[PDB]
A paper describes a structure:
They form the basis of a highly cooperative, concentration-dependent genetic switch involved in both activation and repression of R–M genes. Here we present biophysical, biochemical, and high-resolution structural analysis of a novel class of controller proteins, exemplified by C.Csp231I. In contrast to all previously solved C-protein structures, each protein subunit has two extra helices at the C-terminus, which play a large part in maintaining the dimer interface.
The calculated Matthews coefficients were 2.38 Å3 Da− 1 (one monomer in the asymmetric unit) and 2.01 Å3 Da− 1 (two monomers in the asymmetric unit) for the cubic and monoclinic structures, respectively. Thus, there is a crystallographic dyad between the two subunits in the cubic form, whereas the subunits are related by a noncrystallographic dyad in the monoclinic form. The following analysis is based on the cubic form of C.Csp231I. The total dimer interface area of C.Csp231I is 1410 Å2 compared to 1040 Å2 in C.Esp1396I and 710 Å2 in C.AhdI. The striking feature in C.Csp231I is not that the dimer interface is larger, but rather that 75% of the dimer interface is contributed by the extended C-terminal helical region (helices 6 and 7; residues 67–98). This is achieved by the interleaving of the final two helices from each monomer. In fact, the five-helix bundle that makes up the main conserved domain only creates 310 Å2 of buried surface area on its own. Surprisingly, this domain contains the only pair of interchain H-bonds (Ser62-Thr66); in contrast, C.AhdI and C.Esp1396I contain a total of four and five interchain H-bonds, respectively. The analysis of B-factors in the cubic crystal form of C.Csp231I reveals that the extended C-terminal region of the protein, comprising helices 6 and 7, is significantly more mobile than the rest of the structure.
Residue numbers in the entry:
A (entry chain A), B (entry chain A): 1 to 96
Amino acid sequence: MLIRRLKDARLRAGISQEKLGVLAGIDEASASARMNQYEKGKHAPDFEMANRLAKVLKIPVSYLYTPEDDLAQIILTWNELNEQERKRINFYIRKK
Amino acid sequence: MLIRRLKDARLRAGISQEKLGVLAGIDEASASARMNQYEKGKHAPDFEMANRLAKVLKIPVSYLYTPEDDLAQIILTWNELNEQERKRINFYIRKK
């Protein structure tokens, strides 16, 4: 997991390390210590935990794994496009 | 990691489970057994291993973590766009 992606997305959500961890199913007593390990890159969550984090954060989960800043922006923005404008840009890309 | 993403990308590369594992730094004696665990979803690699896999497979690493088929296609295709056509579609998206 890339730590900047997790931290940026948490701060956009307006929630603390603890609340993110508790909503993602970490025991309350461990939640802030565990989230801080993740956010400092001390160790990384399993994919199942990342999905729970992404659902709390309302982002596509692969945003957390995208090292390319410009691709990460596409992911984050796509997340808020309608079905017409998704399929729109889909075929901008499907020609390449 | 999503197993379909890893398998699709390996088969596009034209290489076996063993060769993928060996190039990604797994010991030769374990390489095919380990890769098959990953591809069957029996357990999942750490992010550092996923990055080594992605570099062998010549894909952006977050392709392996993207459950949305249409977003995964954007990732895969972006991977083969030039700097002008990357920045092109960048601003198709930056207006949203």
